[PDB]
Structures are given as C-alpha cells and as structure tokens.
Symmetry: D3
Subunit: 257 residues, 6 copies
C-alpha cells in the first residue's frame, strides 16, 4: 500500500535530520517539504539528471508531466523501494533507496525514458539513457519493458538492451548484462520472467527465456533458455540444480552447484 | 568518405532539432553550427572531458592542435562512427555515437591522449586517461596502440593496458579487460588482430596474440594465444569452435559451443 | 615512512610543473603548497568528494577532523601509495595515485566513512559511500574492515559489502565483488587474508575465508573457502594449483591452470 | 489584463524560436512550456536567484507558495511589463522584460522578499535582498512599499531603503538612491508618489515627499519636499519649472531648466 | 601594429607565469597558448560571458565567426588596449586590459553584439547586451555606433543607449550615462565626437552633439550641445572654460572651473 | 574588544538557525562550526571569491596565510563589523555584515589584496581587485591604504584608486569615487582623514586632502582640498557649512546647505 511507504519515509526523515547538521537542509529538501512520494521522486530525479544542457527545473517539468499522465510509475517506485528494503540486508529504512542507491535512481529514470519513448519522444529518451549510463553506470535502453518490485543492487555495469523484458519481482546484481546478438534489429534480448534472481556479473544473451522463478548464478554466461524453477550456472551456463524457494528474487541465496 | 558521414550527420541533425524542442539548441551547437567532422568532435570531447581542473574551452585547443597535426585522427573517428552504425542494431543514425555513446567518446579521447603521449606530453595524457576513467568508466592507457573501425558498445568497465594493441575492425563490449600480468615493464597485454569480436565480460591477460578473425566468448578468461579464425570460450578459455564469419567483428554473433 | 613518501612526492611535483604548463597551478595547489601527506590527502578528498549538497571547503574540515583524531589513516594512505607504485608497472611515481587513480581515492574516502561509521555518524557515512560509488564506481560499505598496503588497480565496478574483511597487502583488480548472500543481517561477506591477489572480475560470495597468500583467478566465482597458499579458479571456483610466491599480491602474476 | 500580456508573450516566443537557433530551447523552457504568466515568473526567479546555497529547484517552490497565497504579485508584474514596453523605446516586446531586464527581475524578486518579510521570515528576505544586490546591482530593502506599473530602466546602482514608499506608475533610472539619514530606526526614506519620473543618478535622501506628477532631474540631490506637478533639479535640488505632462513617468522627458 | 601589441603581451605573459604559481596555468591558457590577438580575445570573451544559458565553448564560435567576417574588430580591440595602457596610469602592461579590466571586456562584447545586430541576429545581440549588464555592470545597446581607441576606465554603471555614437579616441569613466529622452524611437542619445573625455558620473541626455576635443566634467548633467574644444560642467552643465589640450581623452585631466 | 563580537555572532547564529530550515546548513557552515572570527572570515571570503581559476579551498589557504602573518586584519574586520552595526539603522545584528553585506565583503577582500601587494604578489592582488569589482561592484586598488572602522554602505559603484588613503572611522556610501587625475603615475588620489562621512555619489578627484571630521554632501564633485570640520557640497564643491558633530562618520546626517 503506497501511503504506508511515504509515511515511514517522513518519520525517518525527522529522526535523521536532527543527527547530521551538515545534511539538515538536504533532508528538508529531499523529503520534508514534499507531501507525496511523487513530489520527492521528481525532486530527486531532477537533481540527479540535471545537466548544463537541461537543468533541474526543466527536467522536473518533464517528470511531473509523466507522473500526471501515468501515476502507476509512482506506485512502481514504491514497490521498488519495498523490494530493496525487504531483500537487501544492508537497507532497513524506506528512505535509503530514494536518497542514496544509484540502482534505484537509474530504475526510476528508465521509467521516464520509457514513457517518453512510447509517446514518440525518442530523441529525448535516448539522451536520458546515455546520461544515466554516464552518471549512474546503468545503461537501460528506454524500449525495454521492466515491471515493478525490481532490485538493482549496487548496479554498476548493468546493461539492459532494447527488446529485453523484465517482469515483476526480479533481483539483479552489479555487472549483469541482458544483452543482444547480431547486427540486425528485431527481438534479440532476454525475457526475464517473474521471481528470477540474477547474480553478479551474469551475462544473458539473445532472445531467450529465463523462466518463472529461475536463478542465474553469478558469473554465468547464458546462451540458451533456462526453464522455470531451475538454477543455471557456468560459462557457458547449464542446469545445475533447483532453487530453494518459489521466488529466488525474494531470498537472494547466491549458492549454486 | 569523411564527406558523406558528415553530410549524413547534418541531415539527421536538421530533422532532430525540428522534432524535440528541449534539445533544438543542443543539436544546433553540437552539430548544425559546424562545417566538418573535426570541428564537431573537438566540441563534444571538450564538453564531456570538462572538469574544474580543466574547462571545455582549454580542452578544445588541445584537441584542435592534435587534429591539425594529425588529421588521420578525424578519418579514424569517421570509421568508428560507421562501425557503430553498421554493427550496433540499437543505432540507426550516424549522429548517435557522436552525440551520446560514451564508448565512442572514450575512444576518441584516447586518440588525443595517444597523440600527446607520443609527442612527449605524458603528464597531460595520464591526466586525461584518468579523467576518462571517472567520466565514462573506460580506462585506456594512452601508450596503447588502437586502430580504426573500432566499436566499444556500452563500454562500462572496459580496461585497456599500456602495451595493448588493437588493430582495425575490432568490436568490444562492456566490462572487457585487455589486461596485464606481472609487476614489470615491457610487453604484457594482449595484441588483438583485425576482425576480432570480444564478448561482454571477457578477460584477456598477458602478452598474448588473439589472431585475425577470432572470436572471444562473453565472460571468457583468455590466458593463451588464440589462433586466427577460431572461437575461444570458458574460464579459463579453450578453443571450442570456428566462427561463422571471416570477420566476427562485423557480425556480432555472440553464440559459442559448450 | 611518511617523510620519505612525502619528499618523493614534492620532488616529482616540482618536475611536473615544468613538464606541463596547462597543469602547473594544479600541481602547485594539490602538492607543492602542502607541508605533509595529510594536508594533501585532505585537499584531494575535499575536491573529489565535492557535491552541490556539500562543498569541497566543508568536506576538508570533516577529513581534517578525522585525521587529527586518528592519524594512522594518513599512514595507511602512504602504504597504499607504495603498494600501487611497487605493484603496478604503469605507475612509477608516488604522486600518480594521489593525483589521479580513482581506486586509490575511493579507498581513502572509505577510511573517512569507516571512521564516521564508528563514531555513530552513519547517515554521513552512507551518504559518502554512495557518492563514491557514483563518482569513482567503487562501492565499499563503511562497516567493512580494510587494512593497509591495498592496491585497487583500475577499480571500476569493485563492490565490498558490510561484513567483509580485507587484511593488509592485498591486490584487487577491476570488477571484483566481495559480496553477500541472503536477506538477513549477520556475517555474510568474504574474509580476505594478508597477501591475497584477486584478478579482474572475480566474484567472492558469502562468509568465506580466502586464506593467506591465496590467488583468485580472473573471472572466477568463489563460493567455498580457499585454503592458504592456494590458487582458485573457474565458475564455480575450485583449487587448481599453488601460487609461485608466498605473497601473490606483490607479484601480480595472473596465470592459473 | 493578464491574459493579454500572456498571449502576447507566447506569440513573440514562437517567433523568437525561429529567429535564433542558439536560444530556441531557452525560449521553450522559459516561455513556450508555461500556461500562464505566474508559472513563467516563478521559472525566471528560480534560475536568476539560483545560488550554491539555495538551488533553482528549491527557490521556485518558495515563489510558487507566495504567488498562491497572494496572486496580486503576478498582476503587479504584468503592469510592470506593460510599463517598460510602453515607456522604454528600446523595448517593443512583452517578453523582453521577463527574459532579460535586470531591473524588472530585481523588482519582482523584491515582491517575493517583501511578502516573506511580512510573514516574519526576515533572514530569508534579507538573504534575497543581498543576493539581488550582488546579482542584479539593485539594492531594495524588503520592508520598502512599492506599488505596480514601475519601470526600473537599466537599473544598476539603484538603492531603495527600509522605510521608502514608491506608489504606482513611477519611472526610475540607473543610479537612483531613495536613501536614509541618521543612525536611528524610524521613518527616514523618501515617499515617491504616483506619476513621478526620476532621472539617472538622482539622490533623494530622508523622510521627504516627492508629490504626484513631479519630475526629479538627472544627477540631482533632493533634501527637501518636492510639491506635486513640479520639476526639481540641481545639487542640492530646488524647484526649476513644471513638467510638460500630468504623469512624467509616462513621457520620460529628461529636460529641465 | 597588431603584431607589436601581441608580441608585447606574450613577453609579459612569460614573466607573469614565472612569478605567480597560482596563476601560471591561467596565464598559459589565456595568453601563451595563442598565436594572435584574435584568438586570445575570443578566449576571454567566451569565458567571462559564459552562462548556464550559453556556455563558453558556444560563445567562442560566435565570436570567432564575427572576427573571421570582420577582422577590423581585432584591430579595434588592439587600439583599445593601447588606449588603456597609455591613458590609465594604474596600467603599465598591454596584458592587463585583456586579462582583468571589465570595461575593456564589455566594450569588445559590444562589438560582437553590434556585428550580430547589423547582420539581423538581433535576438542574440539583446541577450548578450543584458548578459554583459549583469556580469560586468555595463549596459551598451548593440545598435550604438562606437569607434576605436576607447577607454572605459573602472566602468561600473556605464549606460550607452540605442542611438548613441562614440567616435575614436574617447575616454569614459565609471557611472557615465549616454542616455535617452522620450518614449519614441529614432535618434535621442548623444553623439560624442573624437578626443572627448567624460568624467565620472556625468549624465549626457538626448540627441545632442559633444564636439571634438571637448571635456565633460565629473558629475555633470549635459542637456544641450557642447561646442568643440570646450569644457562643460555643472548640474545642469554650462560652458565654463577650454580644455588644456587638443584631445583631453589622451590626457585625462579631471579639473574644471567653477 | 574582539571576543565580544565573535560571541554575539554565535548567539545570534543559534537564535536564527531554528527559524529558516532552508538556511540551517548555511548558518552551521558560515558561523557555527568555527571557533574564532578569523575562521569564519576565511570561510566567507573563500566562498565569495571562488572561481574556476582559483577554487574556494585554494583561496582559503591564501587568506589563512595572510591572517597568520598579520592578525591585525582580523581585528580591523571586527571594528568594521561594529561600525556597520552602530552606524547603519537597518543593521542591528553583528552577524549581518559578515553574512550578507557586499560592502563589508569587498573591504575584507581588499585587505587580503593589500597584504598580497605589500609582499610583492602584485599579479595576484590585481586579479583579486578585478574579481571583487565584477562580483561585488566595488573596485579598490590593492595599493590604497585603508584603516579600520570603515562602513561601505550599499557599496555598489565604489571606486578607490591606487594612491588613495582612507583613515579610521570613515563612512562611505554607494557610487563614491576616490579617483585620479592625469595619465601619469604618482600620487594623484584623495587623502580621506579620520571621521569623514561621504554621501552617495560623491566624486573626489586628485591628490587632495579631505580633513579630519569633514562631511562631503551626496552628489558632490570635490576638486580642491576640504578643511577639517567642514561641509563641502555642489558640482563643483564649495564650503557650505560645518558638520553637526566631531565625527560625521558616526552620525550619518546627510543634510547640507
């Protein structure tokens, strides 16, 4: 439920703003002067994406236009906040993803890019993709189709290509590629279905399925489809076992055979 | 020819300025204002390299001096733009690499650093190497010898050491290391020959040859030479097959055998 | 000794001012104007951790405060400079790590955040952790315990988690993850003992021991303990040989079998 | 009416985007993207009152808050635009004051500070007063009472003190001081009544009356009251004639005897 | 000749870089790097005009285009540098105006705005006028016609309106207004002829002639024409005497009779 | 007494930092984290004089070097704070000059420039003079000799030339020139003796004396010496009267005949 999240964040914003006098005016700015999650998200994205080419105030107008035309982006972000909080044991506050975690920021920046792309504003979407790549080291093509409840933990070196699909409740670590094959357009990127966990450094290549609740071991190179509820690992990857739960995204157990 | 790529780019820029109002001026300053590819390149490298330590306007003189001394660097950039357009299916416009792709920027920044290193301005070349590492997440030592028609797609994590060689028409993906062994000076990094494709996350270490037309599979760790027209894959890498084409850099087929 | 490293840095700085007119004032400000290593480290961290939120002038004051209270951090930095100079054949000068190398800058930033974390100022330590991840592409949790004589060569994509330990005289390359497992707090990150070399791309996951003088091969995924004076390689990693020396961190031999 | 001024501004903005490629995105961001005058005023004040201390994105929120609570400030701005357009023969367009003229920008910044001063937020009002003095070279104390239809032409070196009053339809040129006397609080600054024209460099000092339709000559130093419909000039100023019209602010005739 | 001033400047810059370490790089980038006065001017105007709205690197193209179209603007700047060096006793170096004096910067920024206005790029010229007003506190309308060998000493508060004319070898101090009357278009600002000196705070209003070799005393308010080789002073100004020299702009004698 | 001033400022800094959450981190930075007036002055000058050419951290080192070699500059600034507080009825807090008033800031910037000039660092002093002119619109040549207890109220358009002298306890308003004659070097600027008050827009030209406790009317052009305890006014200036007190700088009575 959306309002829960926002409330917690405000409480946390009070408790914390006393402690660091250095940060006081930063907390008031990012969390305390806003009345909904949407206002805060637009604030942080505006500051995060600001450039000489397009300053913060101009970006915030684009982002607010996107949130007004599609309020479900705000709800997706709330689910993404919850996913990081519940899955990442280094995060126990709802405020942390929104303030600090570049993976969370790159994810919400993609959503604006995606919206822009589906409305025909593709030149702007590509500009934002490549700026997010420079600034947060996450390169997600704005045509990719990404659900909600996604954790991009650490996030540096993530690549998601044009025709990729990432369904709800997926967990992805640093240096993961959902990448293409060939020199031609068309469907050529992975389909990552609900509940999948992808470990650090995994490279998944081509228009292949990674089925519901599968787990991909860290450092794996997946060139063939991976059935649902299965664990794949190695270079190249083979089936080595079965995950310990229904949705490995939720448990983040990195072990494989 | 240089002239075509440049004309194509100008055509694209006119269409782009008319369709996106937030970027009309950006497109005008970076592309429509200029009369040749050399002038557009110096503009984009200047801006993206810019730091408090060294501002855009100072960088631009350095870059222009380099292009006046060695205009083959502009012809090299033009081959690199064409490589990305023909080999990367996410790119349909000649202008995209020049405007947006950090791997293309890093590579043309390398060429400036290389020109400086060879002239004896090593201190400045090392500054820029490390500026490029922070700004574009590509670490290419300026003593490396890198040819043209090179694509660095996505590019985050790419490392290319001091003594590496990369010949013409090579394609390289994100998190590729062309890396060193040992604590000693002298040749210790790979020599990558023409037509080679290197998949994402591959690690190639030491003074070893990767022959013409070879393919290195994603996530591979290559410790021994790879014969021409051969496919290597695994940790550590073994010869597992032969590529489907004479120049796998052109085709970007990522598949390889068990 | 500090005095040695520092004298070498000043001599090199004098020569560099005559080598490159464009950077003479830069070498002056960063090196020639200072009386000791500590003052030049604080100057460098100030300008590199400078944000719109917190400016260079204010961060220097926090770094000076930490160096006064614990001057061993300055001596740790000096050992880190010597480590890069002696181990990295592309670095001959002592000034190079201090001026340019983002792995060296990230490692010293960590020490500031680790000090703040230990004094209970966690909001600021987590703020800096994530700043460093964005600016230098190194993500080190401040609660990690990292010794001295550490080289982080090239450095981009390094991730070190909350409960990791890195003892003295370790060499780590780009895209190395010292990473977690599970969704629970507790010991869950690697323990990297003295003398260990970790090759580019290695992923080491869970609360496991990499013992004295071990070598982890490039691209390897380590899920079980690695005994002392042993080479581990593969995905997943298994024992494949013995290092050619007692401290592979000092020799940087990437070969494995 | 607001609607008129605003429609004129948009029409001019459309033409300017085709006149100058270099500034097309600028005209778009500042004018074409907005739905009313109020939203464009807040955008302009944000980017012009932007500081390292307080960013554009945060100042816009304070300006929007003041315009919601008191929308007559927006209508005052519109009268100020018409005043410059009708009175200044070098300004034909309505967009020009809004885009470029520092006197116009300073005057609208004042209204924000004057509102803040009246709500008791004086630290912020004094902060902005001095920001405007530095950035636009206009020093207006926020407690001054300034009406609407005011032209501050060229504007550099204008000083208006704490207890000054400027009624509607006044024209003031560069280097005009509406200034104090003494070291004590209390009424000590001029009262400038409706229709008055003040020439370049005039110094008007103390709690004195410059009555309806008076003209103050350039370079004059006014120490005693000036009766309505009278011309004052000299150092010190004495009465020298009568203005050629009932509202010299509207005619801008600099001649005196 | 242009060549001398430029050589003199380069000589000065070498000495300056060796003596002040905090500014060695500044001096190198702004002066020692360049091979002619035109290139140094475009560099300094670019940097000082720079705004979030328009960055240095974009300004510099505009400026260079102007100097390529009309290189007399560089010869004009060189006469202005010489005017400041010979007439301002606080300035002994040819480099000081170019580096530091905001009145010299404002004036060369005007020349760019004037070139743009005359070409039909009026919107950009008005942008720059107002950028210069905020950054250097000098408001000079770009339709004004201003010659060369002009000194604007200190310069804060200077206002020059749309229809003003300033001929060669004129010296002007801070808070001088060459100002308008009325709400109507057409000539309404002063025409200042050759050799005129205008003291600090003088206000000169309307379409009136100030003749060759005249002197306008500090703090004066001039409402009627001033004959050649005459001294005007007062509020309002009266003819009070004759200047000590044929060209008071050269001598900068501020004295005038009761 | 110096410590008084500093104390008051800290008390004021607490009382005020509660009120404006926007400014909280700015107050902590400018006033609360410093233990003496010298540290605060160096902070504010560093931020105020920062440029791409010479960032804040580098400037602060120059300024601290100057304050260590000559601590009387810090005391002069304290007397300048007191002068503004006691003479300007719009200022009643000791913090206001230090935080906000560009006249105060330009004065203390001159002192650094003066120190630099007397040590042979003239190229740097001239760079700072011209930056202060651009940034605060006060142009003071660093060779001028300026005492303590000086008020530069409003300050925009002030010019003080190379050979000028300003003794202790002088009050100067906006647009005042202490200016030169001729094209030759040598003594050619005014000598302004103790207690003088100079009104807005006054132009004082040549190597002439303005005697102890004299008053110069606003808008006056002074080309001849002005005896002690005398009032001069007009264009050109003549003796018109005698000031109402011993030191007109203290009372700020702008009236003249």
């Amino acid at each position: 439920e959306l309002e829960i999240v926002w409330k917690n964040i405000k409480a946390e914003a009070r408790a914390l703003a006393d402690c660091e006098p250095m940060l006081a005016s930063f907390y008031h700015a990012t969390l305390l002067k806003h009345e909904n999650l949407g206002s805060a998200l637009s604030y942080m994205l505006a500051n995060k994406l600001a450039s000489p080419i397009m300053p913060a105030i101009a970006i915030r107008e684009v982002v607010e236009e996107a949130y007004a035309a599609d309020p479900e982006m705000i709800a997706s972000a709330a689910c993404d906040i919850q996913a990081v909080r519940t899955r990442d044991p280094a995060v126990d506050k709802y405020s942390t993803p929104l303030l600090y975690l570049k993976g969370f920021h790159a994810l919400q920046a993609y959503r604006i890019g995606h919206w822009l792309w589906n409305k025909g504003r593709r030149a702007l979407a590509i500009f934002l993709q490549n700026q997010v790549s420079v600034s947060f080291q996450v390169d997600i093509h704005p045509a990719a189709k990404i659900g909600r409840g996604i954790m991009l933990d650490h996030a540096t070196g993530i690549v998601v290509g044009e025709t990729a699909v990432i369904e709800d409740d997926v967990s992805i670590l640093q240096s993961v590629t959902l990448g293409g094959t060939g020199k031609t357009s068309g469907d050529r990127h992975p389909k990552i279905r609900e509940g999948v966990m992808i470990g650090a450094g995994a490279k998944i290549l081509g228009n292949i399925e990674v089925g519901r609740g599968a787990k991909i071991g860290a450092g794996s190179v997946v060139l063939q489809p991976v059935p649902p509820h299965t664990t794949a690992a190695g270079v190249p990857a083979r089936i080595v076992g079965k995950p310990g739960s229904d949705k490995p995204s939720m448990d983040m157990d990195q072990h494989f055979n």
